[PDB]
């Protein structure tokens, strides 16, 4: 994927109203209406739009878009960077949430979800889960056959593809 390719993919990723919303904030820092903003303001517009790049990340993006020394970033490149940051931030939040789900599932905090903990959480959902269904989920997620689900196995169980 080239940058035009990446740009089309970034646009495909977003709804048109979100793209417009992002351009409204972006344009507040254009002024000159060139379709670009100073790379100095990139962090500020990304943060106004709920993203949280690190300073190192910003320096990396800036260096990636500013190889000609213009000191600016255009809106299309901006959208590629925003989508990269969204995917990154979303992933981090998911990881965080799964870690929290695991310590809640593991009621006795021994670092594992056993079939009784698995059984109690699944029944607590109100679903008509049978013991056989719970046993089937345990068997299929317990990769090393020790009868319990540790955090690595839980991440695989939950993320599924994983
Ligand atoms: Tb446990
Ligand atoms: Tb296991």
Swiss-Prot record:
UniProt: Ca(2+) 3 binding residues: 106, 108, 110, 117
Domain called EF-hand: residue spans: 17-52, 53-88, 93-128, 129-162
Residues that bind Ca(2+) 1: 30, 32, 36, 41
GO molecular function annotation: calcium ion binding
Keyword Repeat: yes
Residues engaged in binding Ca(2+) 2: 66, 68, 70, 72, 77
Effect of residue 130 to I: Decreases calcium affinity
Gene Ontology BP annotations: skeletal muscle contraction
Modified residues (Blocked amino end (Ala)): 1
SMART domains membership: EFh
Record InterPro entries: CALM/Myosin/TropC-like (IPR050230), EF-hand-dom_pair (IPR011992), EF_Hand_1_Ca_BS (IPR018247), EF_hand_dom (IPR002048)
A Pfam family assignment: EF-hand_7
Chain residues that bind Ca(2+) 4: 142, 144, 146, 148, 153
Coiled coil: none
Alphabetically ordered keywords of this record: Calcium, Metal-binding, Muscle protein, Repeat
Listed GO CC annotations: troponin complex
Other remarks in the entry: Skeletal muscle troponin C binds four calcium ions.
UniProt similarity note: Belongs to the troponin C family.
Function: Troponin is the central regulatory protein of striated muscle contraction. Tn consists of three components: Tn-I which is the inhibitor of actomyosin ATPase, Tn-T which contains the binding site for tropomyosin and Tn-C. The binding of calcium to Tn-C abolishes the inhibitory action of Tn on actin filaments.
Protein name as catalogued: Troponin C, skeletal muscle
Species name: Gallus gallus (Chicken)
Lineage: Eukaryota, Metazoa, Chordata, Craniata, Vertebrata
């Amino acid at each position: 994927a080239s940058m035009t390719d990446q740009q089309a993919e970034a646009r495909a990723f977003l709804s048109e109203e979100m793209i417009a919303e992002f351009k409204a904030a972006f344009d507040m820092f254009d002024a000159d209406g060139g379709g670009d903003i100073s790379t100095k303001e990139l962090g500020t517009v990304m943060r106004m739009l709920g993203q949280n790049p690190t300073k190192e990340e910003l320096d990396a993006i800036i260096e990636e878009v500013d190889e000609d020394g213009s000191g600016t970033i255009d809106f299309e490149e901006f959208l590629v960077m925003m989508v990269r940051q969204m995917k990154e931030d979303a992933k981090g939040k998911s990881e965080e949430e799964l870690a929290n789900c695991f310590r809640i599932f593991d009621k006795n905090a021994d670092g594992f979800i056993d079939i009784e903990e698995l059984g109690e959480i699944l029944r607590a959902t109100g679903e008509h889960v049978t013991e056989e269904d719970i046993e089937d989920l345990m068997k299929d997620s317990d990769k090393n056959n020790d009868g319990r689900i540790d955090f690595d196995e839980f991440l695989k169980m939950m993320e599924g593809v994983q």
